[PDB]
Design an enzyme around this catalytic site. Structure first.
Site, PDB file in Angstrom:
ATOM      1  N   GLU B  54     -12.456  -2.696  -2.165  1.00  0.00           N
ATOM      2  CA  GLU B  54     -12.444  -1.609  -1.741  1.00  0.00           C
ATOM      3  C   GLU B  54     -12.766   0.053  -2.115  1.00  0.00           C
ATOM      4  O   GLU B  54     -13.586  -0.182  -3.141  1.00  0.00           O
ATOM      5  CB  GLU B  54     -10.410  -1.307  -2.091  1.00  0.00           C
ATOM      6  CG  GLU B  54     -10.015  -0.908  -3.738  1.00  0.00           C
ATOM      7  CD  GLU B  54      -8.181  -1.262  -3.608  1.00  0.00           C
ATOM      8  OE1 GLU B  54      -8.542   0.588  -3.361  1.00  0.00           O
ATOM      9  OE2 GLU B  54      -7.865  -1.424  -3.899  1.00  0.00           O
ATOM     10  N   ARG B  65      -7.418  10.860  -6.421  1.00  0.00           N
ATOM     11  CA  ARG B  65      -7.744   9.811  -5.993  1.00  0.00           C
ATOM     12  C   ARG B  65      -7.073  10.057  -4.456  1.00  0.00           C
ATOM     13  O   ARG B  65      -7.667   9.104  -2.872  1.00  0.00           O
ATOM     14  CB  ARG B  65      -7.681   8.316  -6.309  1.00  0.00           C
ATOM     15  CG  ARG B  65      -8.741   7.063  -6.024  1.00  0.00           C
ATOM     16  CD  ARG B  65      -8.866   6.033  -6.213  1.00  0.00           C
ATOM     17  NE  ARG B  65      -9.549   5.090  -6.065  1.00  0.00           N
ATOM     18  CZ  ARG B  65      -8.750   3.998  -5.418  1.00  0.00           C
ATOM     19  NH1 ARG B  65      -7.874   3.475  -5.549  1.00  0.00           N
ATOM     20  NH2 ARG B  65      -9.571   2.767  -5.016  1.00  0.00           N
ATOM     21  N   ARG B  69      -9.048   5.063   2.044  1.00  0.00           N
ATOM     22  CA  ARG B  69      -8.984   4.160   1.741  1.00  0.00           C
ATOM     23  C   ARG B  69     -10.462   4.197   2.812  1.00  0.00           C
ATOM     24  O   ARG B  69     -10.165   3.363   3.831  1.00  0.00           O
ATOM     25  CB  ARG B  69      -9.150   3.430   0.864  1.00  0.00           C
ATOM     26  CG  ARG B  69      -7.623   3.905  -0.307  1.00  0.00           C
ATOM     27  CD  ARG B  69      -8.388   3.738  -2.098  1.00  0.00           C
ATOM     28  NE  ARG B  69      -7.594   4.793  -2.381  1.00  0.00           N
ATOM     29  CZ  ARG B  69      -6.323   5.780  -2.654  1.00  0.00           C
ATOM     30  NH1 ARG B  69      -7.470   6.404  -1.846  1.00  0.00           N
ATOM     31  NH2 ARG B  69      -5.760   5.912  -3.613  1.00  0.00           N
ATOM     32  N   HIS B  85      -2.428   5.901   2.616  1.00  0.00           N
ATOM     33  CA  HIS B  85      -2.993   5.113   1.657  1.00  0.00           C
ATOM     34  C   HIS B  85      -2.102   3.963   1.357  1.00  0.00           C
ATOM     35  O   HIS B  85      -0.534   2.933   0.967  1.00  0.00           O
ATOM     36  CB  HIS B  85      -1.378   5.345  -0.327  1.00  0.00           C
ATOM     37  CG  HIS B  85      -1.036   4.872  -1.282  1.00  0.00           C
ATOM     38  ND1 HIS B  85      -0.527   5.058  -1.557  1.00  0.00           N
ATOM     39  CD2 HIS B  85      -2.595   5.408  -1.805  1.00  0.00           C
ATOM     40  CE1 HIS B  85      -0.173   4.517  -2.927  1.00  0.00           C
ATOM     41  NE2 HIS B  85      -2.594   5.144  -3.264  1.00  0.00           N
TER      42      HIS B  85
END
Lengths: 89, 96
Positions: B54, B65, B69, B85
């Site tokens: 990831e 962050r 992703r 998330h």
């Protein structure tokens, strides 16, 4: 930081995630799933952390070992060097 | 299960910057980037440990962050995006 989980009172994985979001002060955008909990233990939570998970074997029952999957995440973070103390009762 | 296939031009532009960093092997901004992704909820297809990795997609302004992703697989162009998330994922179509 101290986090306490009263294991006899958690009967859903959702409430376990909500109780973790409160006791570990996770971000408001916490995804409430195991991959988000691993991202928060390796990048957000305050350490040292002491996690008291009382009546763990009761939490195992009600949840199907949704509880054991969560506790495995904490054990893996501790094995990578996060300073976590887990105390079960 | 994956929640559909989405054109890369319909994702935030920072997802294209993350794909371009994966193609040059960094340098990445976060030490979490490039670690193995264990797919613990089994939302993505079950694979052995080490198949997926990831990488963060920056959220402009967030100062952390954040929630977005890319997860790579090993098949050609097998890249998944989550913008919530890790709760859901879509396959990216980099041709549109």
């Amino acid at each position: 930081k101290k986090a306490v989980i009263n294991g006899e009172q958690i009967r859903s994985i959702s409430d376990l995630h909500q109780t973790l979001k409160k006791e570990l002060a996770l971000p408001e955008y916490y995804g409430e799933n195991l991959d988000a909990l691993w991202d928060c233990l390796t990048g957000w939570v305050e350490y040292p952390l002491v996690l008291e998970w009382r009546q763990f074997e009761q939490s195992k029952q009600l949840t199907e070992n949704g509880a054991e999957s969560v506790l495995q995440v904490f054990r893996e973070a501790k094995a990578e060097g996060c300073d976590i103390t887990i105390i079960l009762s | 299960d994956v929640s559909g296939t989405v054109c890369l031009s319909a994702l935030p532009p920072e997802a294209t910057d993350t794909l371009n960093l994966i193609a040059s092997d960094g340098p990445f901004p976060y030490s979490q980037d490039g670690v193995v992704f264990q797919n613990r909820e089994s939302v993505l297809p079950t694979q052995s440990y080490g198949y997926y990795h990831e990488y963060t997609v920056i959220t402009p302004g967030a100062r952390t962050r954040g929630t977005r992703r890319i997860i790579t697989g090993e098949a050609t162009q097998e890249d998944y995006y989550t913008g919530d998330h890790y709760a859901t994922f879509s396959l990216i179509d980099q041709t549109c």
